[model samples]
Target: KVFGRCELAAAMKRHGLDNYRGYSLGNWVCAAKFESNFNTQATNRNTDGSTDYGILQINSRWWCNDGRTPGSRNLCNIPCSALLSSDITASVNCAKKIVSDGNGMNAWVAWRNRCKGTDVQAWIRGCRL
Candidate 1:
């Protein structure tokens, strides 16, 4: 499912993403915009044989197991396919694990390159929290 800006914002808040791990909700919403454009089925294959899955693009190499990524750690202990579901619960959980691992939001290159150090509030502007 592809979510509109406000829809995604509400969903993230419902899942307790606001102010998670010292990062504001805008940070997460902004990152999701760049990472997958709010598309739940988004996937990207990496050059290193790993694949990024779902909205936040959680990686297979260190997070979820795709049964294809070489040397996958499966730190999230979930199948990569789980992240692609429109429900987004698995993806959100894995994302929390990523941040809580001390990686911060920088775990995603899209976040660092597009969402970081910016006026992130605009990402959630006019969206009722």
Candidate 2:
């Protein structure tokens, strides 16, 4: 797990993800918190037989291949295990692609369900963004 939320913001900024796709960087921060508690190695098995990967919790159904979803598009062009790595470069790229696909943060169900319409200040309040 990361040291704290500020560390995540710092990483995102270093990765060129600050204010990505017109969404405030805090949006990504909050989404990551809800999706995987900001743990890069976090994974969740969905009822649909799909698994979510990384801090973003990207699904194996389309973004990555976990060997369970045959013929997955794998638009991220990276292995699911890559997303699970504490190094988040691949997952950051994948998340940008997902937002580009018009899903925005909506691509992440955790964001849609838990973060939407909610003030995201808590995520960035003291990060000095």
Candidate 3:
């Protein structure tokens, strides 16, 4: 009940991630689990990093080198561990909104296109649970 599809849906709804679900939360969660274990604290210092930061693990250069726009904030400035402890919706939604120009969930769609095969059939059927 806690981490099932329904709660994931609510979490997505609560944080305005519905738009991203067009890419499917199930798929995103699967990727997150596979890529980061659903742990916001996940991080890596690989060469491609410093350019990126924070959970959603945003690429910092997007905001740092360029600068934040609209309601977006310095997501990477804050620690990933603390982010998970906060309202999960607010925290994750903030990242999605910034990445997707306020269409928070839409960012999830981008992830699907990147991770999955980008086939609608594959995407729609990625991970039911």
Candidate 4:
């Protein structure tokens, strides 16, 4: 599913991403915009042989198991396919774990390159929380 900007914002809020670990919903929304454009089925294969999956682009290398990441830690203990589900619950939970595990939002290059040090609130403007 390709979520609208406000739709994604509301969904992230419902999943407890709002102010999760000092990052605002806007921060999440902004990251999602760049990571996968709010598309639940998005995927990106890295040159390192790891594949990023789903909305937040959870990686197979350290986050989810894809049976092909070579040394996958599977820290999230979930199949990479789980991240592609339109339900998004698994993806959201794993994303939280990524943050709680100390990686923070900086784990996402898109967040660091596009969302960091910017007015992230613009990503969620007019979206009623």
Candidate 5:
């Protein structure tokens, strides 16, 4: 659905997220690879009962509401379904806000555990972008 990693990177860049929260593009790319395997429709139920939505897997507890889940902060103020689309603009925008927090990419557990301080240039290799 994303065409490929390069396409996703290009889209993220176009969305004004070349490097968010002082993290490199490589970190973001690596995070997406682990978060939802790049599947736009990917959804997962967390142990806490909140759902992770879309490519970046924004959580229901704070970012978006799936309607079934109540008491969400709804910080992004968009429906959780909004992130399930093939178009990633909304996802990136919402993720930008999440990363804006002082915690940075650590807000994403996958990034903290998998991509932190690692060489992830291969994530964008041969893209010619």
Candidate 6:
């Protein structure tokens, strides 16, 4: 898996969710079990047979409306950290932020009564990253 546990920890740390390291694999495992089942390229189709994509099971119909890969793929490629020259690390970081951001993973989990909202600015408040 390109986005693995260590990768998630790196991502969480970059986005100021340092406490994620202590989070039970619950949410990560939640994301894996329910959202695309860990397939980085997973997608869904409506009865109309349209598509959604990625491990997070993100629907690409809105938000970043100009993507070639899935929505997460586009955001995943954005350069997050250049100091240490690690793009994958940067991507993992970006993933954590995005997952905790608008209508992302955390937002989806809101339906299950897990994620509260995106208002958490402090590290320990909202995101376990």
Best by lDDT: 4
Q: List the residue pairs that clash in candidate 5.
A: none
RMSD vs true structure, all candidates: 0.8, 1.4, 6.7, 0.9, 1.2, 8.8
Q: How well is each residue in 1-129 modelled by candidate 4, as lDDT tens digits? A: 999999888888998999999999999999989999899999999999999999999999898999998967998999999999888899999999998877689999999999999999999999787
Q: What is the lDDT of residue 94 in candidate 5?
A: 95
In Å, residue 67's CA in model 1 sits off its true spot by: 1.0
Clashes of each: 0, 0, 5, 0, 0, 0
Clashing pairs in 2: none
Q: Which stretches of candidate 2 lie over 4 Å from their true place?
A: none
* TM agreement with the true structure for every prediction: 0.97, 0.92, 0.49, 0.96, 0.94, 0.40
lDDT of each: 0.91, 0.84, 0.46, 0.92, 0.85, 0.42
Sort order, TM-score high to low? 1, 4, 5, 2, 3, 6
- Segments in model 3 whose C-alpha atoms lie over 4 Å from true places: 1-9, 48-55, 63-86, 98-114, 118-129
lDDT of 1 by residue, 1-129 (tens): 999999999999999999999899899999999999999999999899999999999988899998997777999899999999989889888899999887698888989999899999999999977
Query: Residues 1-129, candidate 5, lDDT per residue (tens digit)?
Result: 553788887777778776666666767788898998888898999888899999999999999978867677899989999999999988998998999867888899999999988897778877766
**Stretch of 10 with least lDDT, candidate 6:** 79-88
lDDT of 3 by residue, 1-129 (tens): 124434444565556554463555555554444444455555444463343332354444333322333344454455333444424643565566465665433444335555665443343243333
Model 1, poorest ten-residue lDDT window? Answer: 63-72
Residue range 1-129, candidate 6, lDDT tens digits = 445544544454564544353333345434533555444545565453334445454443332222342433344443212211323344235446565565544445522443233222322333345
Span of 10 residues, lowest total lDDT, candidate 3: 61-70
Report clash pairs, candidate 6: none
Candidate 3 TM-score over all chains jointly: 0.49
| Residue 114 error, candidate 4, Å | 0.5
Q: Model 2, range 1-129, lDDT digits (tens) per residue?
A: 553799888888788777788777778888999888889989889887888888998999888878888666787888899987878889899998999897677888888898888897667887766
Q: What is the lDDT of residue 114 in candidate 3?
A: 57
